[PDB]
Structures are given as C-alpha cells and as structure tokens.
Amino acid sequence: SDVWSLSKTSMTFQPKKASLQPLTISLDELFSSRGEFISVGGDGRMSHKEAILLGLRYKKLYNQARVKYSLLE
Numbered sequence: 001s002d003v004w005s006l007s008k009t010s011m012t013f014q015p016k017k018a019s020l021q022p023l024t025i026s027l028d029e030l031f032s033s034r035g036e037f038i039s040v041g042g043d044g045r046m047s048h049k050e051a052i053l054l055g056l057r058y059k060k061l062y063n064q065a066r067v068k069y070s071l072l073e
Helices: 034-041 049-059 062-068
Strands: 010-013 023-026
Touching: 010 049, 023 049, 034 049, 049 062
Parallel strands: none
Antiparallel strands: 010 023
16 A cells, blocks of 8 residues: 555544643645655655654644654654
C-alpha cells in the first residue's frame, strides 16, 4: 500500500497537560495539494507514525507540536 492510497487513516494524540486537547486527524483529511504532500514528508511508502506526523508541517508547528503532545517518544 502507498501513503496516498491509505490516506484515510487517522491517529489519536494525547496532550501532555490538561490545558491541551487531544488530536485526531488523517492524511487526506489534512492535505489539499499534491506538492504540499511532497514537502510535509510524503514520498510513497509511509511507516505509521510518519504519516500522521506530516500534519505538523501542514499546520507549521513541527517544533512544539510533537513536544507539547504525545507523538514521537
């Protein structure tokens, strides 16, 4: 399967503190451009954590988005 083919798969994120709110978005549900997908980090065969994580690049917050929330540990 390809990252674009299986772009309807989302992942649940949990906030580090009570103030923050959990996140749940998918590839197709967070991208609206072919080239856009390229930058964010979408070649072809994605792993699992990589696909969802691409969202940070879309929203422009890969710095504190992966730290403030439980993404990569």
